[PDB]
Amino acid sequence: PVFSKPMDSNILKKRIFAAVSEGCVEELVELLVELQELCRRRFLMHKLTASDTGKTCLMKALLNINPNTKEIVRILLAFAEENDILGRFINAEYTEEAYEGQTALNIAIERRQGDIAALLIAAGADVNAHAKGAFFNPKYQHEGFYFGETPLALAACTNQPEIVQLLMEHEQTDITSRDSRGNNILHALVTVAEDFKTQNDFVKRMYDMILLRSGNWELETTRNNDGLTPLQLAAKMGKAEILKYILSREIKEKRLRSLSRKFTDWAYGPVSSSLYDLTNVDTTTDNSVLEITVYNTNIDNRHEMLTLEPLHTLLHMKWKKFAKHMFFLSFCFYFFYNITLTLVSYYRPRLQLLGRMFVLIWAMCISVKEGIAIFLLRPSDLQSILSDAWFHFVFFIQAVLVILSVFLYLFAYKEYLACLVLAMALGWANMLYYTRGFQSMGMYSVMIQKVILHDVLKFLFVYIVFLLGFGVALASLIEKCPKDNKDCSSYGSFSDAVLELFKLTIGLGDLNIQQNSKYPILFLFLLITYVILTFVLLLNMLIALMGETVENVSKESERIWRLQRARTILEFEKMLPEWLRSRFRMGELCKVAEDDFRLCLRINEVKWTEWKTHVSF
Amino acid sequence: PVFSKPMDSNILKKRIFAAVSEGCVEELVELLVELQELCRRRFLMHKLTASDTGKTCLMKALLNINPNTKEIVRILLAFAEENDILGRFINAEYTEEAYEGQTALNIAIERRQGDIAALLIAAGADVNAHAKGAFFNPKYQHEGFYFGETPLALAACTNQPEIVQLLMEHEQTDITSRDSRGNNILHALVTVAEDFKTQNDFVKRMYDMILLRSGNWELETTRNNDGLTPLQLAAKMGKAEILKYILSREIKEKRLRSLSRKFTDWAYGPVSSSLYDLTNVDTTTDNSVLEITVYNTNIDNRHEMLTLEPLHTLLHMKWKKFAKHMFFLSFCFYFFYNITLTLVSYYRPRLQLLGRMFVLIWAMCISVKEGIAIFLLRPSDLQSILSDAWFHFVFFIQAVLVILSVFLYLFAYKEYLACLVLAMALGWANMLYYTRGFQSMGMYSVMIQKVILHDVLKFLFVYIVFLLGFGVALASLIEKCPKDNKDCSSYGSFSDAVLELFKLTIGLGDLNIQQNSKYPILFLFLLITYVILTFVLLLNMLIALMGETVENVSKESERIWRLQRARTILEFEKMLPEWLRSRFRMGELCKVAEDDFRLCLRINEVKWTEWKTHVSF
Ligand SMILES: CC(C)=CCC[C@H](C)CC=O
Ligand SMILES: CC(C)=CCC[C@H](C)CC=O
C-alpha cells in the first residue's frame, strides 16, 4: 500500500519537538521558561504547534512511549492552562488527507496508556471527535486499520475494557453516535471481529459488556449508510462466532429482558424447548440475515454459518412446507416439456396437435423468468466458481433456441432444425440441475460443476495449443499427389489433418506410414511424439490431477450441496404471490414490556452428546 | 419435532403460581393466609392446583430453581399437612397426552436437587409412580428423552448416585418393576448408554452399583415387551462398551458369585485360562447375543463388537468344527453343478445321460432353499447397502431360470436357449460369492459389492441421460437418403444412432463426417462435444471418484469380510439336523450354589503386549 507524509520521523521551535521525543524532562524544564517570553509581542502561541501536519508536542510525546512520560504530560497541561489555551491545545487535529481529525486522546488510548488517558478527559476532551480520514477509513482491507473512527471504539476495537468503563461513566459520551460511514460501535466490533474460533477473542465477550452497559435497543437497531443493523452486518462480513452469539443471546437477569433473543421455556435434560425470536431472520421485508447468508459469494466459513438454531429449523420448515411440493411439480412439468420436444424433433415432417404450442408457451415463460433472473444478479455474483448464474443462463439459452426455432419454422427459412436440435441436446443435458434433491445423487452434480471448471478447460487449452501446432506441421510435411488418384495424402489439408490426428487420441481409426510424405523418418517422429506427449502424459496426468482434486473436495461437498439446496429453497419464495404468504410462522408473543415482540418461533431442539458430557460431572 | 402445550410459560389463583415462579417467600407469606379462608365454604381445595394440565405450585417451583427454594417447599408442605391433603398434593400427576403421570419428585430428581429430593420421600411419595407419556416414551430417538419412565432410573439415567442410594434404602422401592414398555432399570441404562469409549461414562460404572445393590439374578433375567434380557438388548441397540462389560464380569468377593460371568482359573503371567460362562451366547434356543450381533444392519460399531472373548473363540471353534468342512463341500458341489451346465448348454442337440437331471434336482433344491431364505428376511435387512439378500436373490434367479429352461425344453416352445444361456452367464458370474474364504481374495469381492452400488449406477444413470439426448439429436440431424443406395445415413434411426454413438465411447469403430447431414458444422459440433463431455470428463472422473472411495474403504474392508464370514458361519448352523446338534460346547459346571451354571466354555487367552505393559511397573 501507499501513505501520505509520516506521523513521526527523526531526520528554534524544533528543539521542543526533539525534547518531547525522547522525553528529557530535565532538558524540558528550561526551554518553556524561554518560550514564555519568546517573541511575546503580537503571535498567539501558534509556534507551539506545527503547521505542516497540525502536530503538537502532546501527541508527539504520546506517539513514542518512554518510561518517563507522565511528567511531560502534566507539565504540558500545567503550561497550557496558564495561557488559557488548554481547550484549543487538547482539541488539536491532524490536517492531512490520510489523517484528519486525529486527537491526542485517540493516540493515548491505543498506546495502552490507561493511566495517562484519564488525564486528558480530566482536562476536558471532546470525546466525540471523529477520525474521518483515508487511513482510518480504507477502501479495501489492506491499506489501513478501521475502528469506526470514534475514540470510544479504540478501547473497544483494542482489548481495553478499563477505558470503556471510564468513557461510559462520562456525562458526554453519546453512545448512539453515527460516523462518516454511518456505523455505530456495535458495527465496529462486528467489523474487527474474527470469524474462526481462534481460542479467546475479546470481541465476543466485550459485545456483552457494551450491550449491557447500553441497556437499550437503539444500538442494535440503527442502520448503516447502506442500511444494516449489525445482525446482518455480521452475516455479510462473514462472522460466524458473532452471529452465533447474537442469534442465541439471553439475559437471565431482570430489568434487562427486552435485549434477550432466545427465551428458554423448559430444560428437561437432553431436551430444551427454546422459544427463539425472529424479527430480521425470516424473509419478511428485505435484507434478512437468512437471505444475506445464502446470497453471498465471498464467505468461506459457511460450513457452520448456515447451521444455527433460528436458521436450520427455519429452512427445514420452509422445505417441508412449500419448497419440496413445488420442486417435484417443477421437475415433472419440466420433464414433460423436455419429453414433448422428442415428439416434435424426432418426428419432424420430413390428433397429436395438443402439444405443439405447449413447448412454445413454456419456453416463453422460462425465457420471461430467466431474463429477469439474469439481470437481477450483479456481476459480483458470477465471480464465484460455483455460482448459480450458469444454470440460470443455460436455462435461458434452452428457451431462446426453442423460440427461435419455432419462429423460423413458420417463417420458412429452412433453419427449423438448426437451433431446435441444439436446444434438444442442451435440454436433455440440462437435467443435471434438477438433481438438487437426492443427497447421494446430489453429491454427484457438484463434482461436474467443480471438475469441469477446474481441470477440463486447462487440459483442453493445453491440448488445443498442442493439437494446433502438430496439425499445421503434419499438414505441411505431406506432398501434393499428382491427382492421378483421389485417395492420396490422407493428411491433405489442415482441416483434414486435425480430424485424422484427433482420431488417434481417442483410440479409433488407423495409423499408416505411407501418407505421400517425402520424409517418412520425420513424419513418424512427429506422429509418435504426439501420442507420447499427449496420450501417455496429458490424458492420464489429468486423471492424476482430479485424483487429488476429488480427494480434496470430497469433504467439502456436504456444505456445497446444502448451499444449492438453500438457494433453490429461498428462490421459490420470491415466486409466491403476496396472498399466498399468509403461511407465516408463529408470532405476536406479547412477552415483553408494553408491545408484541414481533414474531417468535418455537423450536424443540435436543442434544444428547452435550447433555451426556454435562451430566458426566 | 413437535410437542403439546408447554410445561411452563410466562405469558386470583394465578398470583400464587406467579409467586412460586421466582420464589418470593416474603410475597409468599400473606397470600396463603388469604387462601386459608378464600371461599372457604363448600370447594375442596381444587383451586390450589390447575385444571388445564394438572399442574400445582410444587412442581412449578421445582420447574425453575432459584437460590431460595427450600423455604418454599417446606412452607408448601407445612401448609398441605394442615388441610390433611398432603397425600393428594404430593401425588399430583400431569394430565395431557405428552406428559402423563409426571410427579413432583420426578422433576425434583432431574434438577440435581438431592437435598430437596429427600423432603418429598420423607413426606411420603409413591416412588413407583410411572411416567407413561408420549414425551417420555418417544417413537424414534429425536422427539424426546427416554429413561424407563420410573423415578428410580432418573438418578440412574442421570449421574446422581446419592439419590440411587437414598432410593435403595427405602422400604418401598420395587427394584424388579416393569413399565409400559416392559423394561427394567438395567434395560434403561442399556438404552441411555454410549457405545463409543468417550473418556468417562457413568453408565458402565453405575451398572456395577445397581447390580451389586440388587445382589440377585432377577434384574438380568427379566424380558422386554418383545422379550429381551439386557445381554442381547445391549447387542441390538449397538452398545460395545456395555456388552464388553457384561460379557466379561467377575466379582472377586464372596456372597456375590452367582452374578459373575468370567470365572478365572489361573493367571500365569501373559497366559490366563479364563473359564467363560455362556447361557444366552451360543445359538442354543433363540435370540442369542451372537445371533443378534451378526443379523443386524444399523450397527456401525461392529469393528470391536464381534471380537470379544466369548464370541471370537466361539466363532473360530464353530468354523474349525463344522463350517469349513461344509463350505468346501458346497464349493465343490456347486462348481460341479456349474460345470455340468457346460455339457448341456454348449453341447446342445443342434452314455453321458447321468448328469442330465442332476442340474434339475440341484436347481430344485437351490430354489426350495432360497425361497425360504428370501421371505424369512424382513425388508429392514435389505435397507443396508452390503446386505446378504442380493446373493440370496441371485442364487434364486440362477435356479428359476434353469428350471424354466428345462421345463420349456421338453414342452417344445423353442425357448430352451432363451433362459438357459442367461442362467449360464449368471451362474459363472455367481462364483464371486464363494470367495468368502481366502482372506486376500476375500478382500476383493467386497470392492465389487461396494463400488458397483456406489459409483456404477450413478455414472450409468448420468451416461444414460446423456446418451439418450444426444441419440435423439444425432438421429434427428441426419437426412433421409433417396434410397438409390442402401449404405446411406449410418445414423439412420434412433436405435442405430444409439449403437453407433455408444461404439465411440469404448474406442472401437470409425468416425466419419459425411453422414448424409445437411449441417456438417452442427453434426461435428455435437459429435465432438459428446466425446469431450463424456470420455474426457465422465469416464475418468469415475476413476477419480473410486480413487477416493477405495482409499476410504480400504481400512474398512477387514471388518466387512469378517462380517460375511460370520454370517455364512451362522447360516450353515440353521441347516443342521437336530440330531447333529450333539456337538455342543463344554457345560454343566456345577460351580454355583445349588444348581449347574448352564454351559461354561473354557478358553485359554494370551496377551503379551498388555502383560508387558503391566509388568513394566
Ligand atoms: C454438465 C453441465 C452442467 C452442462 C453441460 C452442458 C453442455 C454444454 C451440453 C452442450 O450442448
Ligand atoms: C459381480 C456380482 C456380485 C454380480 C454381477 C452379476 C451380473 C448381474 C451378471 C448378469 O448377467
Curated annotation (Swiss-Prot), chains A, B:
Protein name: Transient receptor potential cation channel subfamily V member 3
Effect caused by changing A429 to L/M: Impairs channel activation by tetrahydrocannabivarin
Coiled coil: none
GO biological process: actin filament organization; calcium ion import across plasma membrane; calcium ion transmembrane transport; negative regulation of hair cycle; osmosensory signaling pathway; positive regulation of calcium ion import; response to temperature stimulus
Reaction equations catalysed: Ca(2+)(in) = Ca(2+)(out); Mg(2+)(in) = Mg(2+)(out); Na(+)(in) = Na(+)(out); K(+)(in) = K(+)(out)
PROSITE patterns per record: ANK_REP_REGION, ANK_REPEAT
Binding site for Na(+): G507
Family (UniProt): Belongs to the transient receptor (TC 1.A.4) family. TrpV subfamily. TRPV3 sub-subfamily.
